[PDB]
Amino acid sequence: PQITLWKRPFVTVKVGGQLKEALLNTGADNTIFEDINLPGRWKPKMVGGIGGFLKVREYDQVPIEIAGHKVIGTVLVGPTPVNVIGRDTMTQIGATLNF
Amino acid sequence: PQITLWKRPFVTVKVGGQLKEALLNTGADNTIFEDINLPGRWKPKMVGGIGGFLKVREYDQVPIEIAGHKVIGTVLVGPTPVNVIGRDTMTQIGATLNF
Numbered sequence: 376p377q378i379t380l381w382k383r384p385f386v387t388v389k390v391g392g393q394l395k396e397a398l399l400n401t402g403a404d405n406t407i408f409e410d411i412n413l414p415g416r417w418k419p420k421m422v423g424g425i426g427g428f429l430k431v432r433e434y435d436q437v438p439i440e441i442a443g444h445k446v447i448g449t450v451l452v453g454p455t456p457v458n459v460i461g462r463d464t465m466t467q468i469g470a471t472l473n474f
Numbered sequence: 475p476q477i478t479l480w481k482r483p484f485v486t487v488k489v490g491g492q493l494k495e496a497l498l499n500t501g502a503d504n505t506i507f508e509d510i511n512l513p514g515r516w517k518p519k520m521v522g523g524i525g526g527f528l529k530v531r532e533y534d535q536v537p538i539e540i541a542g543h544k545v546i547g548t549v550l551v552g553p554t555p556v557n558v559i560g561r562d563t564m565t566q567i568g569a570t571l572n573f
């Protein structure tokens with residue numbers, strides 16, 4: 376797809392078999408969801424930095440599908456204002472910024 | 475240009491005549507800098523939401539140049555961990571996310 380930026384760029388994504396909406400966020404290193412029930416085992420992971428740490432769950436080797444692009448990636452679960460697709464997943468689907 | 479996402483997408487920009495590095499951030503509604511000396515007058519703007527509201531400075535009709543594309547747009551000055559080019563500026567230069 377070719378995604379314009381007039382509104383926040385949400386897409387439908389299937390993650391760990393769960394169908395969700397998430398924002399394509401070139402400002403985020405990692406992909407993170409709240410309110411999801413993923414398969415498999417998780418380990419805790421610290422993200423953020425001083426003044427803004429967050430302890431989240433990290434699920435690895437999770438199947439992710441966006442617009443028919445099927446990849447396997449890491450997915451964090453924890454507090455986030457919106458679900459976020461970060462660079463780590465966007466690089467696997469071959470996404471680019473163009474202008 | 476066409477920019478891949480293996481690294482954070484920093485670009486050189488000239489904003490209000492000031493040469494800076496800033497991150498192309500599709501998860502940001504607004505372009506925002508800390509530490510910049512913009513021309514003209516500013517008005518207060520409320521930003522944020524659930525995590526907290528804060529008043530920042532809004533400069534309007536500011537010249538912005540990125541990769542030879544010249545536009546005029548809004549630039550906020552307030553706390554941010556990185557200089558950000560948000561969707562408002564990216565829409566004016568015709569940027570899209572593609573995969």
Ligand SMILES: [Cl-]
Binds near residue numbers: 394395396397458
């Ligand atoms: Cl959702």
Ligand SMILES: [Cl-]
Binds near residue numbers: 482
């Ligand atoms: Cl980087």
Ligand SMILES: [Cl-]
Binds near residue numbers: 493494495557
């Ligand atoms: Cl800079």
Ligand SMILES: [Cl-]
Binds near residue numbers: 527528529
């Ligand atoms: Cl305030």
Ligand code: NA
Binds near residue numbers: 492493494
């Ligand atoms: Na400078």
Ligand code: NA
Binds near residue numbers: 515533535536
């Ligand atoms: Na102005």
